[PDB]
Amino acid sequence: MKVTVVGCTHAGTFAIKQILAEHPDAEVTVYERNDVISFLSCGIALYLGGKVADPQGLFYSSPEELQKLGANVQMNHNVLAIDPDQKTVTVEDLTNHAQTTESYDKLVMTSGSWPIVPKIPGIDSDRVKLCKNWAHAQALIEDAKEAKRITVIGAGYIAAELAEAYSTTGHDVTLIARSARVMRKYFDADFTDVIEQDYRDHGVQLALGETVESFTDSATGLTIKTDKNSYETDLAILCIGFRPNTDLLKGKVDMAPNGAIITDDYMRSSNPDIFAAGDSAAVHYNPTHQNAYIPLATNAVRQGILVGKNLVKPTVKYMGTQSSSGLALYDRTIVSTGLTLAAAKQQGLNAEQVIVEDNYRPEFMPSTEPVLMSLVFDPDTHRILGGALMSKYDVSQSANTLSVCIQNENTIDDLAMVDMLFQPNFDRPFNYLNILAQAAQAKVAQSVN
Amino acid sequence: SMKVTVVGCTHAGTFAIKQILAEHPDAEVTVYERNDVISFLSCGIALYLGGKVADPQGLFYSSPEELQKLGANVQMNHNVLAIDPDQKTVTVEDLTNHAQTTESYDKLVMTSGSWPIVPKIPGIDSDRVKLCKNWAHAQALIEDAKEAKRITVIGAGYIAAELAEAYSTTGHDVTLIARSARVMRKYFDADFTDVIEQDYRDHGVQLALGETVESFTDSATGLTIKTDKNSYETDLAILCIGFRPNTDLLKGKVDMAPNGAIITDDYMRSSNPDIFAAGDSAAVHYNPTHQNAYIPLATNAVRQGILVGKNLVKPTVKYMGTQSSSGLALYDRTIVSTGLTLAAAKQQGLNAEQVIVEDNYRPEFMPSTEPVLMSLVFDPDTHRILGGALMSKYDVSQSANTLSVCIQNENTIDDLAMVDMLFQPNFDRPFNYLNILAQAAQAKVAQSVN
Amino acid sequence: MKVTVVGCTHAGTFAIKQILAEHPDAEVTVYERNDVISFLSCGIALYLGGKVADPQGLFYSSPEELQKLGANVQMNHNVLAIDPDQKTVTVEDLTNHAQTTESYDKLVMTSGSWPIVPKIPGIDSDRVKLCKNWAHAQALIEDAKEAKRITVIGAGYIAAELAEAYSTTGHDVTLIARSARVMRKYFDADFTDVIEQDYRDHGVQLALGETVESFTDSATGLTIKTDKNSYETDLAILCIGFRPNTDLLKGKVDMAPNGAIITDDYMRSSNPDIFAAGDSAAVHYNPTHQNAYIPLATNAVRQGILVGKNLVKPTVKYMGTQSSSGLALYDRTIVSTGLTLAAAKQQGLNAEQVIVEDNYRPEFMPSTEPVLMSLVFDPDTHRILGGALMSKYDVSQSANTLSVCIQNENTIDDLAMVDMLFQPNFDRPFNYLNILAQAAQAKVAQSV
Amino acid sequence: MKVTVVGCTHAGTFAIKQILAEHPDAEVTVYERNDVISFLSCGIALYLGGKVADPQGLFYSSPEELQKLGANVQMNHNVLAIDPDQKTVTVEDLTNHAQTTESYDKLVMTSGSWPIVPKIPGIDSDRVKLCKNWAHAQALIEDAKEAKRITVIGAGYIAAELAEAYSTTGHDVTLIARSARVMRKYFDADFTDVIEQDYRDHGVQLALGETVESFTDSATGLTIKTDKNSYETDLAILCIGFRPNTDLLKGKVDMAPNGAIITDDYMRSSNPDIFAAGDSAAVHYNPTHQNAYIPLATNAVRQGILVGKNLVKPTVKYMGTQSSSGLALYDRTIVSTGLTLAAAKQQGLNAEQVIVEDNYRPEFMPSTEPVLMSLVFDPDTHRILGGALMSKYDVSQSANTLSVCIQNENTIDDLAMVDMLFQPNFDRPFNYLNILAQAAQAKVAQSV
Numbered sequence A: 001m002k003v004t005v006v007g008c009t010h011a012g013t014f015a016i017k018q019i020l021a022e023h024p025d026a027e028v029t030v031y032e033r034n035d036v037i038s039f040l041s042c043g044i045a046l047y048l049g050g051k052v053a054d055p056q057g058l059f060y061s062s063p064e065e066l067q068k069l070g071a072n073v074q075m076n077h078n079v080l081a082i083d084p085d086q087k088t089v090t091v092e093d094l095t096n097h098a099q100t101t102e103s104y105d106k107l108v109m110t111s112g113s114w115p116i117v118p119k120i121p122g123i124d125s126d127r128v129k130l131c132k133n134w135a136h137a138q139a140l141i142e143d144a145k146e147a148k149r150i151t152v153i154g155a156g157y158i159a160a161e162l163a164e165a166y167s168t169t170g171h172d173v174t175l176i177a178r179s180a181r182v183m184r185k186y187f188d189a190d191f192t193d194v195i196e197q198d199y200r201d202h203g204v205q206l207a208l209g210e211t212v213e214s215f216t217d218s219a220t221g222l223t224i225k226t227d228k229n230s231y232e233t234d235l236a237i238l239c240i241g242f243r244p245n246t247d248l249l250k251g252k253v254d255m256a257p258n259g260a261i262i263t264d265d266y267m268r269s270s271n272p273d274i275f276a277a278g279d280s281a282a283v284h285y286n287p288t289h290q291n292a293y294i295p296l297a298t299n300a301v302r303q304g305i306l307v308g309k310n311l312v313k314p315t316v317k318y319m320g321t322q323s324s325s326g327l328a329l330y331d332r333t334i335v336s337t338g339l340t341l342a343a344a345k346q347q348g349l350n351a352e353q354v355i356v357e358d359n360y361r362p363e364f365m366p367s368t369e370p371v372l373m374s375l376v377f378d379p380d381t382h383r384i385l386g387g388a389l390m391s392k393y394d395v396s397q398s399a400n401t402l403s404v405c406i407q408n409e410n411t412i413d414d415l416a417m418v419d420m421l422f423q424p425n426f427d428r429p430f431n432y433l434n435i436l437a438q439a440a441q442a443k444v445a446q447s448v449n
Numbered sequence B: 001s002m003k004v005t006v007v008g009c010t011h012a013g014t015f016a017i018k019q020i021l022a023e024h025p026d027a028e029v030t031v032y033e034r035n036d037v038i039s040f041l042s043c044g045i046a047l048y049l050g051g052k053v054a055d056p057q058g059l060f061y062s063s064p065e066e067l068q069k070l071g072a073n074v075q076m077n078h079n080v081l082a083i084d085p086d087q088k089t090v091t092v093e094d095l096t097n098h099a100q101t102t103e104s105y106d107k108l109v110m111t112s113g114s115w116p117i118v119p120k121i122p123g124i125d126s127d128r129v130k131l132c133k134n135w136a137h138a139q140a141l142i143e144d145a146k147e148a149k150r151i152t153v154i155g156a157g158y159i160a161a162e163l164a165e166a167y168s169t170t171g172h173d174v175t176l177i178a179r180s181a182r183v184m185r186k187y188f189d190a191d192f193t194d195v196i197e198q199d200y201r202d203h204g205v206q207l208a209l210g211e212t213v214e215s216f217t218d219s220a221t222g223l224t225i226k227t228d229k230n231s232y233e234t235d236l237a238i239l240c241i242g243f244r245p246n247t248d249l250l251k252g253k254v255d256m257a258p259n260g261a262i263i264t265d266d267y268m269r270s271s272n273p274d275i276f277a278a279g280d281s282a283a284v285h286y287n288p289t290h291q292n293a294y295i296p297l298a299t300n301a302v303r304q305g306i307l308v309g310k311n312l313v314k315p316t317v318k319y320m321g322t323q324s325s326s327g328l329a330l331y332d333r334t335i336v337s338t339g340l341t342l343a344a345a346k347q348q349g350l351n352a353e354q355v356i357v358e359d360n361y362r363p364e365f366m367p368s369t370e371p372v373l374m375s376l377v378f379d380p381d382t383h384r385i386l387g388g389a390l391m392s393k394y395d396v397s398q399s400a401n402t403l404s405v406c407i408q409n410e411n412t413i414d415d416l417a418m419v420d421m422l423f424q425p426n427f428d429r430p431f432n433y434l435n436i437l438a439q440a441a442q443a444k445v446a447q448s449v450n
Numbered sequence C, D: 001m002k003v004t005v006v007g008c009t010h011a012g013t014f015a016i017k018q019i020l021a022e023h024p025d026a027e028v029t030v031y032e033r034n035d036v037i038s039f040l041s042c043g044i045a046l047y048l049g050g051k052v053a054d055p056q057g058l059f060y061s062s063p064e065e066l067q068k069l070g071a072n073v074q075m076n077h078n079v080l081a082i083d084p085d086q087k088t089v090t091v092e093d094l095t096n097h098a099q100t101t102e103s104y105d106k107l108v109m110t111s112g113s114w115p116i117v118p119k120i121p122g123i124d125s126d127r128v129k130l131c132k133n134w135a136h137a138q139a140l141i142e143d144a145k146e147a148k149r150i151t152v153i154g155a156g157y158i159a160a161e162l163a164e165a166y167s168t169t170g171h172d173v174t175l176i177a178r179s180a181r182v183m184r185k186y187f188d189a190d191f192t193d194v195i196e197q198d199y200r201d202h203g204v205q206l207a208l209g210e211t212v213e214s215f216t217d218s219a220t221g222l223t224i225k226t227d228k229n230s231y232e233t234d235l236a237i238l239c240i241g242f243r244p245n246t247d248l249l250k251g252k253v254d255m256a257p258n259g260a261i262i263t264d265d266y267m268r269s270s271n272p273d274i275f276a277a278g279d280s281a282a283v284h285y286n287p288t289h290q291n292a293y294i295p296l297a298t299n300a301v302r303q304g305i306l307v308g309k310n311l312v313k314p315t316v317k318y319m320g321t322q323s324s325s326g327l328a329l330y331d332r333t334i335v336s337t338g339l340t341l342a343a344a345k346q347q348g349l350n351a352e353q354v355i356v357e358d359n360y361r362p363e364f365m366p367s368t369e370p371v372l373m374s375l376v377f378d379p380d381t382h383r384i385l386g387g388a389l390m391s392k393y394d395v396s397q398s399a400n401t402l403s404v405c406i407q408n409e410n411t412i413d414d415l416a417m418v419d420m421l422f423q424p425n426f427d428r429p430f431n432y433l434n435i436l437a438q439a440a441q442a443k444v445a446q447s448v
């Protein structure tokens, strides 16, 4: 069986290794516009912030490793087209513009995504960088040497990380986005208000509710004009989302409005021999049980695995995702999973939430820390619809506990009393997650009288 | 109208008290407690002993004034002498004047808890042999410590471990003795307990295992302990050999296990429909085995204490069972577990297998990282997860609760292997260390098929 | 004295009457592109929803009226250029393209605003409609008797009211807004959730948190594409906001980053001989003491009067504004003034908030209604920064009382105790405004 | 700390709760002749007109709740003496006539007021009734059933309410008033003419400018004789006014000529250890900045909270009052605040007024209502002194907007232009309050 892989960062890497372990009698050929694989862009910000001392340690594999098991790995190759009918791909070597067309028995679309770039005059400016791959990274390190004033466009995870990183390293940092509050897509106001006061306490300038219009690169730097003001920075970084790199298959496979490849529960697109995984596909979102586009490295490794398991026939079903996510900002651990209250009612769902703030362990310990918590739930079925935790004590593991509850369709009543260890070194007699759910019950008890 | 009398009041009684009131306000609740204190965090003694509790009063989360402040007929310093399930009455003698009184009730709450295990050994009532459970024992251990350079803990549970570790860091010369083969063998397997022992030995703690204490002999030099394998002399010995349900008030009257622990239905109600049981005096449904068992943990007491309130009048909220989730911190190392151990499931003859994994909880390219030794116990046919544990100097305690939810929901090793879990280099690899743990299980099952 | 007035809708209409009465000797000339004046755009949604018998009532002044008062009225006239240093303006008679150049002593820039339009593909369609003036109203009034599907683009005041009018008159209403909450700029999330649910109760389809990529003329209608979906409608009404209509002076007087003319307390532009009022100028936002762009009719009528009074020498000062506003939606009266908590927290202001619901009058009365109230305030100075009220009972007036509170820099303690009448027909012993401020006092003391 | 409270209706109830909260240590003792508290005597007229349904709703507190909060609640007690120098109070149990004596550290004087009783022959008749008590209302409920002819003696708030109430439920209502026009104390003749005419609309006989000489008891009815006529009736209700019920301290603390206990900004009497709140005390009248007597429930609730606030030391200051009031007569809403033009002309104050009627919202709306407006002000400082509004539409809240204006000493110039929202559902572009002040602006410039 001849198998070809389009794109190879994380989704393609795991699929490659998986397909060769499950079907060693296969001829696997992978193409990638780049030269490397398995680069952890998730760790770029840490690298810029000075938290990474060896950059090659951000690669958990290499073209050599994949080709040691039998992978026909063609780096520097740009797949130019795929015809689902003749089952061939047209690729062009980037080292000499050599075009070729090969047939295949199965094709895996792991082409991922690409940053979203608006149609804003002045975009063409070189002082406006993108942030996605190891090439953008290596550019930022140097170009962040003589760029004292740096500006980030967007208000997502990347923008938050980049801003903090450049802020704790002696830069005049500015952050701009149409969002009303930072990281609105992941946390509710009570959380994002604390982060902004942090961003302000650390000198970062916040220009929210404003959308850029142009970029007039002067001899004094890059001049950004938003529809409410203008700012003068030395470098601007685009951090305003991802869009699936699904041009080759547009109109050729069922997609979402953004170009995300719809799939069944075994990673098969509408073309029964074309698979997708990662930033190029749409994941089943359990909180809504409807497909969604949530580009996360977690979906790329899992989806990449299932492809190998299901290449020849259906074997293991995708478990969907709660979109569990989190990060560290100014020593605070900020994690969440599932729906935010805003994102649930914005979809008209029957949703309520509780925001609890309790110390994570008894006050008699030598030290303790406040943990701000949120629980989104159905007021009728009592089904948990998501949660979030913020604390200088690493509460990140709790978000994965909430993820399990959502995966298992658990209610606030389940979480209110589910067994959880107790030890003053760790929590109160009731783990802070139990207490959180018991507030949901108390909330619903108030409404039942 | 409805007369409720609570027997005992540490944790299982307190919550039940606060619960009944808010749930059944037109009720007259009377509670008797031999002590003068309630809600004493005994689980903070070693921390107090170890010197990490400066304000010992912060170890109580309530007080009789509070309960009476809500309307509880609070009666401290009273010992319930007997209970008649027929005429529905109790006899109690005031400890301040030996005044007996027989009172009636419509419902009884049997939250009498437990008491340490004191064996028939010679030289036992020697004051150099002390107990550790309530606020009275801790206050004495505070005094008996100042003039007890050498200290011996008898047992091999979490307490003996917590106490041995606490004293060793405070300058004492400590020795540990127990019939067990490995420290905390009923909670962790060999790969974990061997590292714990290495810490002890690395901290000067003298470990004497497999030895059966046979006598204590008072001596102006101190106390001399005789074990079939040797004889030691310490200044103080602490009984840490487990609990026994303090239920003999109801013997022959309600269904109890071999150790006198009360059996309850799914709503904490004993075999007598008007006698509820919560906490260390009852047996809990153990989900990993779906049988009744004796897991005396403060987690059960508060939960069962609550359930007694919502159900005191009629079945309202079913008990969810327990996985026995527990864990401690020994020498800057987080040790937690939940469910069955491999040996404990094997010792029960269940289809069980296990993987032991050790990986850094987050990628090495981070400025720091710590190894996390992990263990998963699962059914090799059903692939159902039966138990697990983690050990690391990184606080992995919350992952034990994650495993608890998988067991509660009867999750398999495949579910845990691919369940969505966040990734951020500050916390873990692209796959959380729990996903990795479960994927080693699958790997273990993917071989014996071939 | 020669006085030139550009545009005459509301601000221009007031400055003219004021000027001709303040100094009934000057020569006043007013140029207006349209053929009518004094048209209340704030009545478009109420007709479209079928509530205005004779739409001739939406006009309160007229050219003949202004020319009788002594002004020279030139309807259908585009002003093609203003020459400040020369103090001249060049205009074209739209009726015959004829151009003339006239001199002025003073110029009044009442050019107002124009609806924001997106640089997009498909925006030129005849199914994409604007909604600002008399012409737009008749077009939407004519092309609405057949159009079953109607889509409003925007989450603001205009969009919310158009959706309500059409929805209440048998229409498939879809509101596509990029902001995640309808009318985010006026009410914190607590008020809007009831509003958004009110729309769902009435079958309106809300496409919030989406941006329209383009409009595409499809077979069975016009297809609207966003980043998360695509929508089919017969008519798309743009309610995305307004932009100052001040290109005539772009680079000739001090302007805000959006083109709004920056004035002083007497409405004088950076050029003294040039006054501005209404949607062409900025306004002093008393809550912050900064200049905001608050294009409300209340500001046009007020500044127009001040132009006519400060035309020679600064006579009366501008008081600023708290941007008091409100509307009626599905039986509910919804009013606001000053800042919300989100905007306050957004602009780096020390602010907290209390939310309170209460039956505006005693329950023993034959009837009563709950009132959802919000008060935004500085938690350490106690000063009131803004407030909002919502109820099926007409609480509109209470938004004016708050404005006077903000105008005088009152505190929650002032509002908590200030004298307010009591009679069971109207309120409780303590007026709900008193009760609203008292709850703010408790929160202040709770965290002390 | 020992605290004794005399009388517990409204001011007493609030001072109690404020003391128990801010001082859960002091010892609170309260005495009340009656067997209830918190009864709103403002609902009797509604309940007599059958507009209330469960008079148990006219009680917002109770002895139990107050005792459950930590106070000693002595119901059915008639304190018979106060000894400041000794700091004791002699009380008497009404259930057994017993008598004791208690010491106090602070005593709150909330004895309220009592209906002015006229020295008249026949004033003993059981057909002559009062109307201030919960018991009073019960006797008024029983009587009305067999009472076709009800006579109201007075020209103020209570009489007008009761007359309208009984007139709308099928009674022969006669109103006798020494005053020449009903409610001369709150509204100028321009408003009372409509009200007096309204009564003549609904078959209510007005006896204005007359004084009763006697009540002649008879079989077919009690005949009432005045200096100008005679009237037979089945029931005559007295509502001539209120008098301070403060004899316990006559000669022990400063008082107004009517007995009102003079307090300072912190509600303390001439004796520093005795507070006064409610109908027992005079209040600082902001419009005049003098002490006056206005027994309003709004006065009592505010002052009560101030006693518990400054009980130990002056903490919060009394902000004065505009005596904002209002009632619902037939199909109209009449509200007032501050001074009338007549009341100002009678006290030697620079005062002018304007009167403006106007449809409260645009006529193009489906419906609108005229609004009669009054604004009293100083014609040379432009300071606002008072105001009033009347209209079928609920303009109640606008009386509170004016009190804030008076509170902050604003002028007609502030009100003429201060920001106020516009929306046809609510008002014209300029709020009718703005229009009113603008009317006042035109009269000063008409004489400058």
Ligand SMILES: Cc1cc2nc3c(=O)[nH]c(=O)nc-3n(C[C@H](O)[C@H](O)[C@H](O)COP(=O)(O)OP(=O)(O)OC[C@H]3O[C@@H](n4cnc5c(N)ncnc54)[C@H](O)[C@@H]3O)c2cc1C
Binding pocket: C006, C007, C008, C009, C010, C011, C012, C031, C032, C033, C034, C040, C041, C042, C043, C044, C045, C077, C078, C079, C080, C110, C111, C112, C113, C114, C131, C132, C133, C158, C245, C248, C277, C278, C279, C280, C295, C296, C297, C298, C300, D421, D422, D423, D424
């Ligand atoms: C549907 C809609 C509903 C609204 N509802 C409310 C409400 O309920 N409450 C409220 O307070 N506000 C409301 N507003 C806002 C209010 O209508 C505006 O703020 C008000 O119209 C501004 O008055 P203006 O005269 O200063 O400017 P405009 O009304 O915008 O008039 C500007 C004039 O300038 C003319 N002009 C521009 N350039 C030239 C030129 N070169 N030559 C000649 N003439 C020129 C234009 O023809 C135009 O007529 C609403 C607005 C809209 C569109």
Ligand SMILES: NC(=O)C1=CN([C@@H]2O[C@H](COP(=O)(O)OP(=O)(O)OC[C@H]3O[C@@H](n4cnc5c(N)ncnc54)[C@H](OP(=O)(O)O)[C@@H]3O)[C@@H](O)[C@H]2O)C=CC1
Binding pocket: A042, A118, A153, A154, A155, A156, A157, A158, A159, A161, A176, A177, A178, A179, A180, A183, A184, A185, A211, A212, A239, A240, A241, A242, A294, A295, A296, A325, A326, A327, B423, B424
């Ligand atoms: N720790 C983690 O797990 C991390 C995960 N990621 C993942 O990688 C992907 C890409 O990251 P990122 O770039 O942060 O994308 P995100 O979606 O996380 O953030 C993009 C943000 O930019 C805003 N935005 C979009 N367009 C514009 C515009 N024209 N002007 C101003 N602001 C705009 C959006 O706000 P609005 O939607 O309100 O318009 C949005 O919140 C994400 O999908 C995320 O899942 C990235 C970084 C860290």
Ligand SMILES: NC(=O)C1=CN([C@@H]2O[C@H](COP(=O)(O)OP(=O)(O)OC[C@H]3O[C@@H](n4cnc5c(N)ncnc54)[C@H](OP(=O)(O)O)[C@@H]3O)[C@@H](O)[C@H]2O)C=CC1
Binding pocket: A422, A423, B043, B119, B154, B155, B156, B157, B158, B159, B160, B162, B177, B178, B179, B180, B181, B184, B185, B186, B212, B213, B240, B241, B242, B243, B295, B296, B297, B326, B327, B328
């Ligand atoms: N962090 C936590 O979770 C903590 C939990 N607890 C709970 O409190 C309860 C009491 O704890 P603990 O006292 O440890 O009870 P445990 O049963 O947990 O520990 C007692 C141990 O002592 C050994 N032992 C018993 N009898 C003798 C004897 N005569 N001579 C020598 N050794 C003996 C047993 O080992 P073997 O079985 O090998 O013979 C047994 O493992 C437990 O249920 C525990 O779960 C208490 C403290 C901390």
Ligand SMILES: NC(=O)C1=CN([C@@H]2O[C@H](COP(=O)(O)OP(=O)(O)OC[C@H]3O[C@@H](n4cnc5c(N)ncnc54)[C@H](OP(=O)(O)O)[C@@H]3O)[C@@H](O)[C@H]2O)C=CC1
Binding pocket: C118, C153, C154, C155, C156, C157, C158, C159, C176, C177, C178, C179, C180, C183, C184, C185, C210, C211, C212, C239, C240, C241, C242, C294, C295, C296, C325, C326, C327, D422, D423
């Ligand atoms: N009753 C009243 O007082 C009324 C007053 N007015 C006034 O008239 C003027 C015009 O009103 P209106 O049309 O409501 O203007 P508004 O600014 O009030 O409303 C525009 C709304 O549309 C949203 N929006 C902006 N751009 C886009 C886009 N590209 N895609 C999707 N949504 C977008 C904005 O949300 P976000 O800002 O969160 O992005 C904003 O809330 C306003 O200044 C207003 O003050 C109008 C009607 C009634």
Ligand SMILES: NC(=O)C1=CN([C@@H]2O[C@H](COP(=O)(O)OP(=O)(O)OC[C@H]3O[C@@H](n4cnc5c(N)ncnc54)[C@H](OP(=O)(O)O)[C@@H]3O)[C@@H](O)[C@H]2O)C=CC1
Binding pocket: C422, C423, D042, D118, D153, D154, D155, D156, D157, D158, D159, D161, D176, D177, D178, D179, D180, D183, D184, D185, D210, D211, D212, D239, D240, D241, D242, D294, D295, D296, D325, D326, D327
């Ligand atoms: N909704 C509200 O706010 C209400 C408030 N109240 C308050 O309660 C208090 C008591 O009310 P009420 O007793 O009605 O007093 P009011 O002030 O309401 O009315 C009493 C009126 O009766 C007239 N009067 C006095 N003596 C005689 C007499 N011998 N013969 C005929 N007429 C006479 C007086 O007119 P003149 O002074 O012109 O001689 C006086 O204005 C008032 O102070 C009032 O403020 C009462 C009812 C409703």
Ligand SMILES: [Cl-]
Binding pocket: B181, B190
């Ligand atoms: Cl072993």
Ligand SMILES: [Cl-]
Binding pocket: A189, C189, C342
């Ligand atoms: Cl929000």
